[PDB]
Amino acid sequence: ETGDQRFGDLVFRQLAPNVWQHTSYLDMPGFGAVASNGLIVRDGGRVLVVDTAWTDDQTAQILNWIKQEINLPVALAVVTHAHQDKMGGMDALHAAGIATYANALSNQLAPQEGMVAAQHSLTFAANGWVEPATAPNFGPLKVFYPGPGHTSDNITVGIDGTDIAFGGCLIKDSKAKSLGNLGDADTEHYAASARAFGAAFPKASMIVMSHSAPDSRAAITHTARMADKLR
Numbered sequence: 001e002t003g004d005q006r007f008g009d010l011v012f013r014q015l016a017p018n019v020w021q022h023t024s025y026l027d028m029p030g031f032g033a034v035a036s037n038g039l040i041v042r043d044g045g046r047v048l049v050v051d052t053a054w055t056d057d058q059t060a061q062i063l064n065w066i067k068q069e070i071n072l073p074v075a076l077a078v079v080t081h082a083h084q085d086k087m088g089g090m091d092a093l094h095a096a097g098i099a100t101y102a103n104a105l106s107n108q109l110a111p112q113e114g115m116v117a118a119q120h121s122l123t124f125a126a127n128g129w130v131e132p133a134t135a136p137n138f139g140p141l142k143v144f145y146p147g148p149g150h151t152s153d154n155i156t157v158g159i160d161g162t163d164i165a166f167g168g169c170l171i172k173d174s175k176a177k178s179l180g181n182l183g184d185a186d187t188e189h190y191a192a193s194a195r196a197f198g199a200a201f202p203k204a205s206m207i208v209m210s211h212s213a214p215d216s217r218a219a220i221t222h223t224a225r226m227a228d229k230l231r
């Protein structure tokens with residue numbers, strides 16, 4: 001779509017004055033090329049990243065795009081669970097000197113999932129909000145653990161000062177006919193987790209997700225409606 005920029009294999013789209021979506025693609029062999037989206041946030045004199053790309057090389061291209069187009073240091077990255085689309089590029093972040101954060105559970109599961117763990121672990125209260133001492137200096141990033149759904153470790157992030165919340169792989173677009181890859185899913189708690197994400201970011205009107213283009217809040221309720229049928 002017009003307005004989008006390509007750098008290498010990555011596509012970028014501005015969502016807000018200080019927010020961009022990054023999109024990377026993995027070619028399952030002779031199968032569907034599969035898109036995955038993350039976010040880039042300009043916070044004053046620094047940049048914050050949400051999710052790697054599928055690969056280290058694709059991840060370096062994110063970082064090089066930021067250097068060329070924004071020209072501010074990346075202070076940290078938060079990754080949203082231990083699958084290849086979200087943590088495939090951790091080695092690239094580390095090679096670049098970025099501090100990395102993930103749900104403690106993501107870091108614990110990372111080895112079995114064939115992912116490199118992030119450096120630092122987020123933990124969460126019973127109400128789902130990140131324990132702030134584990135997410136120091138996150139600026140406008142508000143990190144919320146909605147409960148198990150796409151995976152037991154899936155986390156979400158709202159961007160304060162914008163209309164944007166990022167549901168990662170938990171949320172599907174409002175015309176989706178399935179819930180995608182359920183290989184690590186919790187089918188019993190999924191619906192409640194989708195709804196909890198909506199409740200955490202009641203003011204968000206643009207919902208960004210890993211595997212569809214940004215949607216309205218309709219994505220949340222539609223996802224929950226699908227998930228209701230798993231139980």
Ligand SMILES: FC(F)(F)c1nnc(S)n1/N=C/c1cccc(Br)c1
Binds near residue numbers: 085
């Ligand atoms: F549209 C799809 F199919 F891409 C999708 N929608 N929701 C989910 S989750 N997916 N797939 C996610 C996925 C596919 C291959 C490998 C890994 Br690791 C994750």
Ligand SMILES: [Ca+2]
Binds near residue numbers: 056089
């Ligand atoms: Ca690697």
Ligand SMILES: [Ca+2]
Binds near residue numbers: 113183184
């Ligand atoms: Ca798995």
Ligand SMILES: [Zn+2]
Binds near residue numbers: 081083150151169
């Ligand atoms: Zn996933």
Ligand SMILES: [Zn+2]
Binds near residue numbers: 210
């Ligand atoms: Zn995914």
